[PDB]
Design an enzyme around this catalytic site. Structure first.
Site, PDB file in Angstrom:
ATOM      1  N   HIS A   1       0.808  -1.224   0.000  1.00  0.00           N
ATOM      2  CA  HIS A   1       0.000   0.000   0.000  1.00  0.00           C
ATOM      3  C   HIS A   1       0.846   1.281   0.000  1.00  0.00           C
ATOM      4  CE1 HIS A   1       0.166   1.714   4.049  1.00  0.00           C
ATOM      5  NE2 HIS A   1      -0.002   0.512   4.553  1.00  0.00           N
TER       6      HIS A   1
ATOM      7  N   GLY B   1       3.060   6.909  11.339  1.00  0.00           N
ATOM      8  CA  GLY B   1       3.384   6.124  10.131  1.00  0.00           C
ATOM      9  C   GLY B   1       4.336   4.972  10.438  1.00  0.00           C
TER      10      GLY B   1
ATOM     11  N   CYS C   1       3.770   1.832   9.457  1.00  0.00           N
ATOM     12  CA  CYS C   1       3.549   0.711   8.553  1.00  0.00           C
ATOM     13  C   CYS C   1       4.880   0.264   7.961  1.00  0.00           C
ATOM     14  CB  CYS C   1       2.581   1.027   7.426  1.00  0.00           C
ATOM     15  SG  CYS C   1       1.152   2.001   7.956  1.00  0.00           S
TER      16      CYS C   1
END
Ligand SMILES: CN(C)c1ccc(O)c2c1C[C@H]1C[C@H]3[C@H](N(C)C)C(O)=C(C(N)=O)C(=O)[C@@]3(O)C(O)=C1C2=O
Lengths: 293, 290
Positions: free
Chosen positions: A37, A137, A139
């Site tokens: 993603h 953030g 991820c």
């Protein structure tokens, strides 16, 4: 409750950027792994079509930054939900490593990074519903175990779930549990206490001299499961029992007897006392964890 | 989650130090290896030790320093309060940017637990009000940017299970000694300011069930709090929450009213940040970071 030393993994962390978006990546040999993603804007995250977005991309579309040296990307593929970036420079700090898929209940350490920068480490467990109650953030932050000098990668973070918890993939990019890398409401599914881990941690308490919570009773497995499931605990299977065999044997207390103790501790509370200096029961400590320590 | 700093920078400084009977961890910085001075005690010596006498009796050859593979040549040895310093002939290439600092009770740090020079684990903890923390030569630290603040070196294991140690200048945290005499814990207290900070965390998250209308003055609070074994709250403690008060709006004394209530009333089976128990190992600063 300790995490593994994070050094080996710190030297594999990089920053990956694709236009607007930025995530952590795992740099192993001459491949950077990260969540696919990273090619989505926050808008795309509703109904993304990763095949379509990916064909539209070239090597120069991806910025990979290892500290402040920039790595040249020379190829890219996708494997389920992880992107792979071939770079021209093999990582000198690559540790010996394996990729594994872990069972719900099993523990690992997570290195939480921000923009490719490591910022923290914690021990956690794969919850029975395939979530992690973490702190992201972040991820692309990865979870791992160490076996002497072999690093077992078992987790990469992808999604933040509405209920506050985290979902992710193994390093093949297959999600743990029934989640998708897509920002639609997706139900967690109610959690449960990891019964086997609790039982292991009680054995740890006794190994260490704590006996205050033992009792004269025993139980049958079913009677236990019935009681336990009523305080939201996971069924205990004969496998779970076998794995406690090493620990039963050390202390000379049968699994089912220790199960009686747990029965009662649920009934009674702690009475201001503590077990291993904890007033709460611990369920993120596996049979194997206790064996190691 | 309560998180530790990444331990990499510190891992690259860990070594094994051996002096006859004893072996434990040392911290290798530049061309100096730092470790607990009791490494020169046999299990006999540790009863009524004379460190001056035991130290003069030692040569550089008497110390084995092992850095993973290689053996380091020692070329000098001195002692500074309760840590030994061993001058070796090779500067540590993996030396990070670092400071040695002393922390206050209440403040938090991460610990890299080693065995025989080998890192095995890393955890977050706090300097408890009685200067304990809930092996020997394993260090505690904080990281800022790329700066490692060493604040702790483990020395003694106390009968009550918990740990006592020095700063890296070898000055004990609390009234303990590097001597094998039975030593009292000295009963603990909940670290009040940290609790209040963690409440602020709860509110700037989602949990608001415990906010309340009434306000209370410092002394009334402290009297109530000290009744459930909590630490006195100072004007300093208050200042450090100032940052947090302003974000969320809630005046310090008002938030103090909430805590008052929580102690007197319980939680009514409810939870805060998904936890039934109050957390006191999260400083004002920690919560700001998170
Ligand atoms: C600990 N306490 C003294 C007792 C004693 C007897 C009981 O029969 C019970 C408790 C505690 C509570 C705790 C909680 C459980 N606990 C945190 C493990 C729990 O997670 C739940 C839940 N539905 O999530 C309960 O129903 C629960 O209310 C429950 O079934 C209890 C319960 O049945």
């Amino acid at each position: 409750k300790m995490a593994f030393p994070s050094g080996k993994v710190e030297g594999c962390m990089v920053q990956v950027t694709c236009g607007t978006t930025t995530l952590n990546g795992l740099w192993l040999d001459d491949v950077v792994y990260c969540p696919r993603h990273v090619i989505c804007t926050s808008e795309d995250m509703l109904n993304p079509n990763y095949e379509d977005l990916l064909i539209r991309k070239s090597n120069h579309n991806f910025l990979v930054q290892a500290g402040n040296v920039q790595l040249r990307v020379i190829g890219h593929s996708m494997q389920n939900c992880v992107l792979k970036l071939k770079v021209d420079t093999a990582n000198p700090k690559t540790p010996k490593y394996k990729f594994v898929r872990i069972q719900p209940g099993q523990t690992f350490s997570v290195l939480a990074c921000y923009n490719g920068s490591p910022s923290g480490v914690y021990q956690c467990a794969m919850r029975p519903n395939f979530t992690i109650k973490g702190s992201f953030g972040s991820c692309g932050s990865v979870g791992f175990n160490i076996d002497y000098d072999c690093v077992s990668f078992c987790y990469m973070h992808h999604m933040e779930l509405p209920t506050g918890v985290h979902a992710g993939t193994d390093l093949e990019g297959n999600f743990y549990g029934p989640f998708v890398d897509r920002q639609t409401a997706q139900a967690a599914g109610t959690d449960t206490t990891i019964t086997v881990n609790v039982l292991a941690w009680l054995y740890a308490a006794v190994i260490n001299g704590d006996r205050w919570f033992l009792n004269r009773f025993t139980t049958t497995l079913n009677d236990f499961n019935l009681v336990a499931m009523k305080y939201n605990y996971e069924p205990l299977t004969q496998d779970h029992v076998d794995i406690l065999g090493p620990l039963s044997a050390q202390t000379g207390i049968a699994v089912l007897d220790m199960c009686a103790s747990l029965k009662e501790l649920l009934q009674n509370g702690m009475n201001g006392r503590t077990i291993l200096g904890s007033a709460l029961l611990e369920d993120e400590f596996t049979p194997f964890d206790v064996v190691r320590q």
